Amino acid sequence: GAMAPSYRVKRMDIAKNDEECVVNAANPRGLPGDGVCKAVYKKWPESFKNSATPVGTAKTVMCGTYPVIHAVGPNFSNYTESEGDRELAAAYREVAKEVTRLGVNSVAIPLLSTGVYSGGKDRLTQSLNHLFTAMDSTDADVVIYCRDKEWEKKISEAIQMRT
Ligand SMILES: [Cl-]
Ligand SMILES: [Cl-]
Ligand SMILES: [Cl-]
Structure with missing residues (x-):
C-alpha cells in the first residue's frame, strides 16, 4: 500500500497518468467508444482484448504489465435514477476489489457516468461520493482525473473538506 494513502485531483488526459494502473470509463461491449474510453483505446489498445463486461462490473486486462481496469457505469439515458444509482455504486465497489487484488500502490480514476452516460445531468457529487464509498477502505493513492476547470x-474542495 501507499505510506499515507491520499486522494488527489488532476485536470488533464488520464492517458498521461503517473499511477500504477488506470480505470477506463468503459462501455459494456469493449468498443473504443468516446471521451475517456477513446483516449484509453488510443494509449492501451491491447487492453481491449476480451474486455466486454456487464453494467455495474469491472474487468482488468493487461497492456504489457500495465493494468487497465475496465469499469462499466450505467447510461442514465436508459436506467431509472434508482437503478442507475445502484449500478454506479456497484461499478466502483468492483474497481476497489480489482485495485486491491492487483496490489498496486496508486490508481488513476475518472468519474464514472458523468459525461455521455450522465443523461444530461450534473453527476459530479453522486459519482464522487460512490467513488469515496468504495475506495476509502483501500490503501492505494487515488488520483481522480477530470477535464473541466470548475x-x-x-x-478538490470535496477532498479537502474530509481531511
Ligand atoms: Cl492533457
Ligand atoms: Cl460517461
Ligand atoms: Cl470533467
Missing part, C-alpha cells in the same frame, strides 16, 4: 475546483 469540476477540478469542486472535486
Whole structure:
C-alpha cells in the first residue's frame, strides 16, 4: 500500500497518468467508444482484448504489465435514477476489489457516468461520493482525473473538506 494513502485531483488526459494502473470509463461491449474510453483505446489498445463486461462490473486486462481496469457505469439515458444509482455504486465497489487484488500502490480514476452516460445531468457529487464509498477502505493513492476547470475546483474542495 501507499505510506499515507491520499486522494488527489488532476485536470488533464488520464492517458498521461503517473499511477500504477488506470480505470477506463468503459462501455459494456469493449468498443473504443468516446471521451475517456477513446483516449484509453488510443494509449492501451491491447487492453481491449476480451474486455466486454456487464453494467455495474469491472474487468482488468493487461497492456504489457500495465493494468487497465475496465469499469462499466450505467447510461442514465436508459436506467431509472434508482437503478442507475445502484449500478454506479456497484461499478466502483468492483474497481476497489480489482485495485486491491492487483496490489498496486496508486490508481488513476475518472468519474464514472458523468459525461455521455450522465443523461444530461450534473453527476459530479453522486459519482464522487460512490467513488469515496468504495475506495476509502483501500490503501492505494487515488488520483481522480477530470477535464473541466470548475469540476477540478469542486472535486478538490470535496477532498479537502474530509481531511
Ligand atoms: Cl492533457
Ligand atoms: Cl460517461
Ligand atoms: Cl470533467
